[PDB]
Amino acid sequence: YSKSMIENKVFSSCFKSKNERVDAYSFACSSYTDKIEEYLYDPANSFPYKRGVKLVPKENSIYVEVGADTDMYGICVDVCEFSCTAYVLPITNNFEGYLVTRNPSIKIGEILDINNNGVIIKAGGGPPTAINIYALSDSFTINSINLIKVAIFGNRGLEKT
């Protein structure tokens, strides 16, 4: 898929709850001194936008591919499809923003984990979580893709259950 996604016959119809857009600005709270890196991504394997990515050093360049929490390099916050370039916030930096999830029913304050597809899921799935992820809001569906506001702050000392 894509982020921008088209001519319309008519325009689409308060200030509240207007941020529920797939192409919304990922950082709920931004900050200067946040490190952002550029990498290449596979244009036919998996679309890394708003997903946890890992570094795959290929024979021609270092790419980023959707990955699990065990081998996560960071979070892909934006993509330039013209150059097929992914922008990554390293895991060493804090993040507070909207990410792609696969569970349409997640409550606030729950512990979360990133799966092999770079997707937010409930931490009770069984895999030992290695990152501190907490749900700051209930998951919402855009009609279909599920998004959720999360706070990610570093790695977890001892893997939980």
Binding site: C14, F15, S17, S30, Y32
Partner: protein, 309 residues
Amino acid sequence: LFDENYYAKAVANIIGEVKDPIMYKWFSPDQIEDVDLQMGYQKTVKWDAFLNANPTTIANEVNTISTIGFSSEVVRLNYLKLQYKFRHLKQTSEKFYTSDSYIGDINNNLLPFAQAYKLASSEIIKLINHFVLTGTVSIQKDGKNQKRLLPNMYGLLNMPEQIKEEVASGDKDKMDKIFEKIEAGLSKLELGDEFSTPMMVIVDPATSLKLVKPYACEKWEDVLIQTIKAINNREDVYIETSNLLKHKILIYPLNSELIKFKPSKYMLPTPNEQVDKDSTDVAHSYIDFVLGGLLATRKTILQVNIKQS
């Protein structure tokens, strides 16, 4: 300054395209008085006089004369400073994004600084209007994840020590019961000698729909206006509908001696001098605003809440 600060020049040139806040319609011209304070508290002192006894008749010789006393009351108001950050294109880079009849990246959702500032200011003004009407700060439709505010920072709907009426969930569709509660609140209203003043009523869209129903060839709105004219010395009665309210009815006078809005003169959005810059074409800018300053006398606001559950 305009020779050096392109962003200041653009703000000056486009500041006029931001529409006026809708909260100005809820107050009289005399009720609003600006103050000079960004963040902190301000103490306002109100003086009064009273008669100690009956006046003294001046006849022949007399030295003992009746006296007039004085009294004071101090009210503290809290003001809070808030900020927002937005991204925009760079001035030296706009030329490479000036397309036909528009400027900016459609794909990357990047805008020139002037348009970005105008849109951000409009959104912040909407937030300020919502805070002034309700007294809470939230960006969700459910009204949750509210930002915790300081004490002595109230809106019209949550101002304490006012008349509060509650319509039961079983009577949520009975306009007769709602009007009975409204009459009870109006009776409990205390305006004293300042009763001769225009009155303002603010209702939610559902209550507005109910008001135009026939009275049980007269309308509930007409009956309510007559009832309010009975108490306000038959002055003007204004009715307003706001989508910022939900199953609430606000009734209050437009007299500056009872309710006064003393906002900071920096309450409306103002650019910050700091602009984040790097080697790319994207820059970041900050907008500041100030919240707080509503003062009201006791028992001069009627707030009716119609419970839904």
